[PDB]
Design an enzyme around this catalytic site. Structure first.
Site, PDB file in Angstrom:
ATOM      1  N   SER A 146      -1.433  -3.572   4.405  1.00  0.00           N
ATOM      2  CA  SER A 146      -0.462  -4.449   5.070  1.00  0.00           C
ATOM      3  C   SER A 146       0.675  -4.719   4.090  1.00  0.00           C
ATOM      4  O   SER A 146       1.311  -3.751   3.640  1.00  0.00           O
ATOM      5  CB  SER A 146      -1.184  -5.684   5.616  1.00  0.00           C
ATOM      6  OG  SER A 146      -1.683  -6.500   4.571  1.00  0.00           O
ATOM      7  N   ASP A 254      -0.070  -0.403  15.131  1.00  0.00           N
ATOM      8  CA  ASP A 254      -0.516  -1.448  14.222  1.00  0.00           C
ATOM      9  C   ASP A 254      -0.313  -2.819  14.855  1.00  0.00           C
ATOM     10  O   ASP A 254       0.759  -3.116  15.389  1.00  0.00           O
ATOM     11  CB  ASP A 254       0.239  -1.354  12.897  1.00  0.00           C
ATOM     12  CG  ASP A 254      -0.317  -2.290  11.845  1.00  0.00           C
ATOM     13  OD1 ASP A 254      -1.378  -1.976  11.266  1.00  0.00           O
ATOM     14  OD2 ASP A 254       0.302  -3.344  11.603  1.00  0.00           O
ATOM     15  N   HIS A 303      -5.587  -2.921  12.576  1.00  0.00           N
ATOM     16  CA  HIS A 303      -4.833  -3.453  11.445  1.00  0.00           C
ATOM     17  C   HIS A 303      -5.662  -3.293  10.182  1.00  0.00           C
ATOM     18  O   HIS A 303      -6.780  -3.812  10.112  1.00  0.00           O
ATOM     19  CB  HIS A 303      -4.477  -4.923  11.677  1.00  0.00           C
ATOM     20  CG  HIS A 303      -3.570  -5.497  10.635  1.00  0.00           C
ATOM     21  ND1 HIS A 303      -3.912  -6.593   9.874  1.00  0.00           N
ATOM     22  CD2 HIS A 303      -2.335  -5.123  10.225  1.00  0.00           C
ATOM     23  CE1 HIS A 303      -2.924  -6.874   9.042  1.00  0.00           C
ATOM     24  NE2 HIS A 303      -1.957  -5.996   9.234  1.00  0.00           N
TER      25      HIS A 303
HETATM   26  O1  LIG Z   1       1.596  -8.373   5.931  1.00  0.00           O
HETATM   27  C1  LIG Z   1       1.640  -7.894   7.145  1.00  0.00           C
HETATM   28  O2  LIG Z   1       0.736  -7.267   7.660  1.00  0.00           O
HETATM   29  C2  LIG Z   1       2.933  -8.194   7.862  1.00  0.00           C
HETATM   30  C3  LIG Z   1       3.265  -7.089   8.882  1.00  0.00           C
HETATM   31  C4  LIG Z   1       4.782  -7.022   8.942  1.00  0.00           C
HETATM   32  N1  LIG Z   1       5.194  -7.349   7.575  1.00  0.00           N
HETATM   33  C5  LIG Z   1       6.028  -6.510   6.794  1.00  0.00           C
HETATM   34  C6  LIG Z   1       5.617  -6.087   5.533  1.00  0.00           C
HETATM   35  C7  LIG Z   1       6.442  -5.274   4.773  1.00  0.00           C
HETATM   36  C8  LIG Z   1       7.665  -4.870   5.261  1.00  0.00           C
HETATM   37  C9  LIG Z   1       8.089  -5.283   6.511  1.00  0.00           C
HETATM   38  C10 LIG Z   1       7.274  -6.107   7.268  1.00  0.00           C
HETATM   39 CL1  LIG Z   1       7.869  -6.662   8.801  1.00  0.00          CL
HETATM   40  C11 LIG Z   1       4.174  -8.201   6.963  1.00  0.00           C
END
Ligand SMILES: O=C(O)[C@@H]1CCN(c2ccccc2Cl)C1
Ligand SMILES: *[C@@H]1O[C@H](CO)[C@@H](O)[C@H](O)[C@H]1NC(C)=O
Length: 359
Positions: A146, A254, A303
């Site tokens: 993630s 995801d 996920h």
């Molecule tokens: O931590 C997670 O699973 C979230 C999922 C979406 N997020 C995210 C993480 C890095 C770059 C861009 C995004 Cl939008 C965080």
């Protein structure tokens, strides 16, 4: 069997609240392979939203309540049954306590309420590990899930560059980005960015960098230039600029991607508009992985995977992820006989792969 906590000897490298950051380690002295896993857990991009995160998610912002041991699971497991890939390697679990997608390099002061030092946490962990066996390592696999998966893309080249400047050219730095390959796409239904569940992935990163003092890989930074560094948080934009070998693991659907897109798949009827959106999402993500030669992308609604106990169960084209990672290892010693590394599902709906996780 477990990984022991080590708070960073440099107490100026801290977590959000100023408490020292750290890492959990289990050594395997008969092995030259090191796995450094970056934990995930979303983020926070302003004082008000970080204050709420400190009230009910404090472990992701402080080390004061960290347990002294952790059990390695999935790719972090030392049991060959659970981890057919790297069960004998040195295991490192780096807790996520900077809330900055591992990009920050800003210390707490009389001006800033919290410290965002995720990028400095990684480098300091690597520095202190060199005196514990990493100096003689053959392969350093920087992995993460993630936000930790996106952190791999942001930091894998920085770690390779750090080990070269410190005088260790023999260490092969590689990346394993799990569930950190996101699309800056349009939401299914618009939501004004106020938190994260009610926020789009593009606007969340744009304001996060300015609050974290976040840094991105250099070649990607020089493409998008000042003010547009948020682009380097999206895998399909930053990956082509990376020098280190990176294996990408990404569910085609995801749950976190669907969340920031304001899609909620419960058990209700799925109308034509939502069906088209979901199918287009899987197509777009499949397109971004076309030129990623080492990838594992099942058509599932899920996920994270690589630190789950049953990460060995999912298959794409008849090949599991641990096998695909082993073939990736062999390719870095062109295609191999019976050892594929590019495994992207082509069917267009969640759970059209029968090996998708069920619960
Ligand atoms: O931590 C997670 O699973 C979230 C999922 C979406 N997020 C995210 C993480 C890095 C770059 C861009 C995004 Cl939008 C965080
Ligand atoms: C400890 O960390 C701080 C912050 O990154 C850095 O300025 C300092 O040089 C580090 N100390 C040592 C001995 O490397």
């Amino acid at each position: 069997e477990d990984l022991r906590l080590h708070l960073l000897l440099n107490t100026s490298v801290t977590c959000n609240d100023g408490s020292p950051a750290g890492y959990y380690l289990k050594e395997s002295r008969g092995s030259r392979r090191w796995l450094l896993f970056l934990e995930g857990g979303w983020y926070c991009f302003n004082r008000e939203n970080c204050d709420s995160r400190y009230d009910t998610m404090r472990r992701l912002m402080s080390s004061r309540d960290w347990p002294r041991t952790r059990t390695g699971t999935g790719i972090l497991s030392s049991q060959p049954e659970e981890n057919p890939y790297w069960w004998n390697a040195n295991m490192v679990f780096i807790p996520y306590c900077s809330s900055d997608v591992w990009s920050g390099a800003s210390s707490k002061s009389e001006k800033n309420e919290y410290a965002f030092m995720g990028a400095l946490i990684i480098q300091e962990v690597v520095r202190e590990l060199l005196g514990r066996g990493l100096s003689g390592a053959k392969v350093l696999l920087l992995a993460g899930s993630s936000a930790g998966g996106t952190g791999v893309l942001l930091n894998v080249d920085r770690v390779a560059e750090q080990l070269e400047k410190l005088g260790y050219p023999a260490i092969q730095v590689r990346g394993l980005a799990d569930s950190g390959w996101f699309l800056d796409n349009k939401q299914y239904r618009h939501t004004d960015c106020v938190d994260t569940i009610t926020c789009a992935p593009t606007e969340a990163i744009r304001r996060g960098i300015r609050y974290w003092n976040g840094v991105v890989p250099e070649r990607c930074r020089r493409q998008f230039q000042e003010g547009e560094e948020w682009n380097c948080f999206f895998g399909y934009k930053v990956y082509p600029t990376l020098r280190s070998p990176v294996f990408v693991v990404q569910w085609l659907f995801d749950e976190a991607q669907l969340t920031v897109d304001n899609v909620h798949l419960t058990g209700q009827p799925v109308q034509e508009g939502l069906r088209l959106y979901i199918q287009n999402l899987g197509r777009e993500l499949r397109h971004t992985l076309k030129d990623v030669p080492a990838s594992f992308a099942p058509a599932c609604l899920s996920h994270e995977i690589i630190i789950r106990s049953h990460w060995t169960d999912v298959q794409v084209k008849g090949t599991s992820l641990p096998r695909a990672l082993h073939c990736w290892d062999r390719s870095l010693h062109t295609p191999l006989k019976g050892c594929p590394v590019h495994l992207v599902d082509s069917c267009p709906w969640p759970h059209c792969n029968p090996s998708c996780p069920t619960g």
